[PDB]
């Protein structure tokens, strides 16, 4: 079927050359001479696009626009007029005009406007597929050759970008990236297993990790006299920052970067390392009060504010600061009300936990299994919360206050696929991406064995304790009810292990506009 065009213009006869040209290109043009005729035509038909002229007898062009957008809000309306007035242009833009063309009109301009407003989705789709197939060989070739951390960053940023651009494409085109994604995870998995021990041993030569975050990305700005809001959104992947960055460009300049999470990828160690500036083991030694062991019943991140103080004082700084933790809407509302009473501190730290709460609810919540069945839904559901929670307005006010913002997280999360059999003490931790214990049977290769936790800067309730970690998208399953739990945990989001999603996380330094 060919596309239909409704063209309303009292001088429609002067446009015969254009109309023949359009009919020549396969379009079915319907002419009328008044806006009343135009509205009636829209009432009784389903045109694909409407060309309107501003100056007509009787009803005006912009009035027909308003009435037409009430009847067919999804049908693009192009305004084609002699007038160059600024109030006419403005009103048309406000009337939701799809495009505005000033007479005299190049016939080829009409052609462009018809392609862009009737086929931009189908066109963008075929280009994206083409441009992806173009870059496919480079991707596999880019990762094939062993590469540096800085290159690993760009490789992942690239895969994320493609993962988002291909949400709309067909399965076949989706799977080509999944393979590349998981193959990258496999290759990234072994990449960290080779160097993780030496990053702990050699802090000078290592990449930025959780204990260095405040030192590399926060202290420079504070020392430079800049006022900062450090926003920690627990469990915020790279692709979740891509999903929300468009909302924030309206208020901020982005200085995007990434850093490496320590293992395990969970708040107990990675987030405590961030605010303390130390590895968990050094937290237990130097500050035994502030560390909470794994076997304890109490929460494991209740002493982040005092840790911040030790970090500030340990570096001989005298920053004024504040700490707020929003784990419940109503608390985040009160914070949004008193936000501007924090204008005195050089550093305001806000922790948001809903995304981690939601990521976990993907397992034990019927609601979130549906609303985040897949990663695209997960990202969309993340966008909805960012917008309609206090978070959006929170950023808006901070931008008004002139505070720079370092937006980052403590770890990501990954959709788990394959079970890894493990058996341990009943008192063994219940995390599915890492386990702590002594009497643990498993296959050493299938996991990432750490028999000397002190070397990787991790404390232990005993001193025969060993750490094991899943890699890629694996997850631990116990032989009891193995058939059941593997069903229950397949395709859920789990953090604590090793993967590009979990470890490679964004740290965005944002300047208000």
Contacts with a second copy by CB under 8 A lie at: 1, 46, 66, 70, 73-75, 84, 86, 89-91, 93-97, 99-102, 106, 108-109, 111-112, 115-116, 119-121, 123-124, 126-128, 131, 161, 245-246, 249-250, 253, 329, 354, 357-358, 361, 365-371, 373-374, 376-377, 380-381, 383-385, 387-389, 513
Q: Rounded to 5 degrees, what are φ and ψ at 8? A: -110, 125
> Measured from the CB of residue 389, what is the shortest distance to a second copy in angstroms?
6
> Measured from the CB of residue 193, what is the shortest distance to Zn ion in angstroms?
22
**Using CA atoms, how far apart are residues 349 and 311, in angstroms rounded to an integer?**
14
Q: Contact between 81 and ligand BEF (CB under 6 A)?
A: yes
Instruction: Say which residue the tokens 């004082």 belong to.
Output: 313
Count of residues in the chain: 513
> Measured from the CB of residue 93, what is the shortest distance to a second copy in angstroms?
5
List alpha helices for 315-451, DSSP H: 329-337, 354-364, 366-371, 375-388, 390-400
Q: Which residues are near Zn ion by CB under 5 A? A: 234-235, 267, 356, 410
* Rg for the chain, CA atoms, rounded: 29
For residue 161, the partner it binds in a second copy, Zn ion, ligand BEF, none, with Cβ less than 5 to 8 A by kind, is a second copy
Nearer residue to Zn ion within complex by CB, 233 or 244: 233
Q: Contact between 106 and ligand BEF (CB under 6 A)?
A: no
Write the CA distances from 116 to 2, 110, 124, integer angstroms.
16, 10, 10
Nearer residue to ligand BEF within complex by CB, 100 or 229: 100
**Using CA atoms, how far apart are residues 471 and 193, in angstroms rounded to an integer?**
10
> Measured from the CB of residue 410, what is the shortest distance to a second copy in angstroms?
20
For residue 326, the partner it binds in ligand BEF, a second copy, Zn ion, none, with Cβ less than 5 to 8 A by kind, is none
Contact region for ligand BEF (CB under 6 A) — 66-74, 76-84, 369-377, 438-446?
A: 76-84
Nearer residue to ligand BEF within complex by CB, 103 or 421: 103
DSSP string spanning 120-166? Answer: HHHHHHHHHHHHHHHHHHHHHHHHHS---HHHHHHHHHHHHHHHHHT
> Measured from the CB of residue 82, what is the shortest distance to a second copy in angstroms?
11
**Using CA atoms, how far apart are residues 93 and 190, in angstroms rounded to an integer?**
54
**Nearest of 446, 452, 396, 441 to residue 420 by alpha carbon:** 446
> Measured from the CB of residue 19, what is the shortest distance to ligand BEF in angstroms?
15
Q: Contact between 54 and ligand BEF (CB under 6 A)?
A: yes
> For ligand BEF, which residue of 20, 43, 45, 55 counts as binding (CB under 6 A)?
55
**Using CA atoms, how far apart are residues 368 and 377, in angstroms rounded to an integer?**
10
Q: Contact between 53 and ligand BEF (CB under 6 A)?
A: yes
Helix (H, G, I), strand (E, B) or coil at 259: strand
Contact region for ligand BEF (CB under 6 A) — 49-57, 369-377, 402-410, 441-449?
A: 49-57
> Tokens standing for 83?
């007038």
């Amino acid at each position: 079927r060919p596309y239909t065009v409704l063209w309303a213009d009292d001088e429609i006869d002067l446009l015969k050359p254009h109309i023949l040209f359009l009919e020549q290109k396969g379009y079915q043009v319907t002419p009328v001479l008044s806006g009343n005729d135009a509205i009636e035509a829209v009432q009784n038909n389903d045109f694909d696009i409407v060309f309107l002229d501003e100056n007509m007898p009787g009803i005006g062009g912009l009035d027909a626009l308003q009435k037409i957008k009430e009847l067919k809000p999804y049908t693009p309306v192009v305004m084609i007029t002699k007038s160059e007035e600024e109030h006419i242009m403005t009103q048309a833009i406000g009337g939701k005009i799809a495009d505005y063309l000033i007479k005299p009109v190049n016939p080829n301009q009409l052609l462009l406007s018809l392609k862009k407003n009737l086929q931009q989705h189908s066109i963008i789709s075929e280009t994206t597929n083409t441009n992806y197939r173009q870059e496919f060989v480079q991707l596999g070739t880019q990762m094939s050759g062993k590469l540096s951390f800085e290159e690993w960053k760009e490789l992942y940023r690239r895969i994320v970008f493609w993962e988002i651009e291909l949400e709309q494409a067909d399965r076949q085109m989706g799977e080509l990236l999944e393979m590349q994604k998981q193959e990258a995870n496999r290759l990234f998995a072994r990449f960290v297993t080779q160097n993780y021990r030496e990053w702990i041993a050699k802090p000078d030569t290592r990449p930025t990790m959780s204990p260095d975050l405040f030192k590399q990305k926060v202290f420079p700005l504070l020392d430079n006299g800049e006022k900062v809001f450090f926003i920690l959104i627990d469990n915020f992947r790279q692709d979740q920052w891509e999903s929300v960055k468009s909302m924030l460009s309206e208020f901020y300049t982005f200085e995007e970067d990434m850093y490496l999470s320590i293992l395990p990828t969970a708040a107990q160690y990675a987030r405590n390392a961030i605010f303390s500036g130390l590895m968990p083991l050094q937290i237990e030694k130097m500050f035994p009060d502030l560390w909470v062991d794994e076997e304890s019943e109490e929460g494991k991140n209740l002493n982040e504010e005092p840790m911040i103080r030790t970090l500030i004082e340990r570096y001989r700084k005298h920053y004024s600061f504040s700490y707020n933790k929003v784990y419940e809407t109503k608390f985040g509302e009160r914070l949004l009300g008193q936000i501007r009473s924090l204008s005195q501190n050089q550093l305001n730290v806000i922790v948001l936990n809903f995304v981690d709460m939601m990521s976990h609810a993907r397992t034990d919540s019927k609601m979130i299994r549906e609303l985040a069945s897949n990663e695209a839904a997960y990202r969309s559901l993340t966008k909805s919360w960012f917008k309609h929670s206090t978070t959006y307005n929170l950023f808006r006010s901070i931008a008004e206050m002139g505070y720079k913002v370092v937006l980052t997280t403590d770890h990501g999360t990954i959709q788990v696929k394959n079970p890894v059999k493990v058996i341990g003490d009943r008192s063994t931790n219940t995390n599915l991406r890492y386990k702590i214990g002594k009497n643990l049977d498993y296959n050493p290769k299938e996991v990432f064995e750490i028999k000397d936790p002190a070397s990787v800067g991790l404390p232990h309730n005993n001193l025969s304790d060993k750490f094991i970690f899943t890699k890629e998208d694996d997850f631990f399953a116990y032989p009891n009810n193995y058939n059941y739990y593997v069903q229950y945990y397949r395709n859920t989001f789990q953090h604590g292990g090793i993967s590009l999603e979990e470890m490679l996380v964004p740290v965005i330094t944002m300047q208000p506009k």
